[PDB]
């Protein structure tokens, strides 16, 4: 996935803090306490660096709320569109803030509603489209979830 | 029967010039600004919330409030959260928001603010006595269950 690096390589110092997209139905006052976008991302990297086993979804979101100011239900839907892949977590925020959009509509690993609605298509073109966007691996995994 | 909370519900919409200043385009959609008066908005709102919803139908209600009253979905969602899901407090939320030029209304029974929620978990007996006087024991316990 190293060809995707560009999606992670957004400089936080280019994003004035707080971003306009950062409202009160998503972030708590701990969030706005940060002094720069970089300060927030660094705390995000630190939190998620922690060792969370697949079973500790609950503690994760709590720690996220507690340490970075991200509301707990917001973390939950994100991890959900990330197929639970914590590594793509900073990518969500950097793209959300960079392009002021929640969620980012054209980012590999970030499954949108329409992406999900496209999983239910027998159209060879529709399947191909999803593979081209997220990758074979992310595709096959997203199916399993969809098939449950 | 009777309740001294009725002063929060019986604000005369004709006394609120339309559209109210606090009603911004980040909160409301074109449909809303097309209502002819505050009362027209309130009657549509009353229609919608007096519809039939199962405890599990927050999503539909929020969609119905967008389509029928022009309230943006993220806003309707924050509101429901402030109201611990009590539909019948929706009209009260808007009447006071519009009347007092505040969002959320900070001193209204049934409308839980950030400060309210912080006092609830502070287990400082004086702050909690104030919450009980504001919202009542019934809402208090409901909110406690809201944090379980």
């Amino acid at each position: 996935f190293s060809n995707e690096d560009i999606y992670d390589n957004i400089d936080p110092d280019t994003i004035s803090f707080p971003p306009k997209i950062a409202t009160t139905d998503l972030f708590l006052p701990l969030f706005f306490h940060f002094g720069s976008t970089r300060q927030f991302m660094d705390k995000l990297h630190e939190v998620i660096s922690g060792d969370y086993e697949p079973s500790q979804a609950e503690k994760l979101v709590q720690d996220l709320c507690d340490e970075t100011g991200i509301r707990k239900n917001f973390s939950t839907s994100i991890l959900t569109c990330l197929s639970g892949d914590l590594m793509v977590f900073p990518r969500y925020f950097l793209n959300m803030f960079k392009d002021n959009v929640n969620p980012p509509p054209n980012v590999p690993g970030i499954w949108t509603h329409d992406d999900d609605e496209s999983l239910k298509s027998n159209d060879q073109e529709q399947i191909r489209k999803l593979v081209k966007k997220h990758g074979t691996g992310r595709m096959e995994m997203r199916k399993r979830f969809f098939e449950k | 029967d009777f309740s001294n909370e009725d002063i929060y519900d019986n604000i005369d919409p004709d006394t609120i010039s339309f559209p109210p200043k606090i009603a911004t385009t980040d909160l409301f959609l074109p449909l809303f600004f097309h209502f002819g008066s505050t009362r027209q908005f309130m009657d549509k709102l009353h229609e919608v919330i007096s519809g039939d919803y199962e405890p599990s139908q927050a999503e539909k209600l929020v969609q119905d409030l967008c389509d029928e009253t022009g309230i943006r979905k993220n806003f309707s969602t924050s509101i429901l959260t402030c109201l611990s899901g009590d539909l019948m407090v929706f009209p009260r939320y808007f009447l006071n928001m519009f009347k007092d030029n505040v969002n959320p209304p900070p001193n209204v029974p049934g409308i839980w603010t950030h400060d309210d929620d912080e006092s609830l978990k502070s287990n400082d007996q004086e702050q909690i006595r104030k919450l009980v006087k504001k919202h009542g024991t019934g809402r208090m316990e409901m909110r406690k269950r809201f944090f379980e």
Binding site: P54, A57, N73, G84 | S56, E59, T81, M142
Partner: peptide, 20 residues
């Protein structure tokens, strides 16, 4: 570092608001 999707998919339903 991946979170079990089951735990998430239900933690979502868990955090949704219930109509009173």
């Amino acid at each position: 570092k991946m979170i079990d999707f089951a735990t998430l998919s239900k933690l979502k339903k868990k955090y949704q608001i219930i109509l009173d």
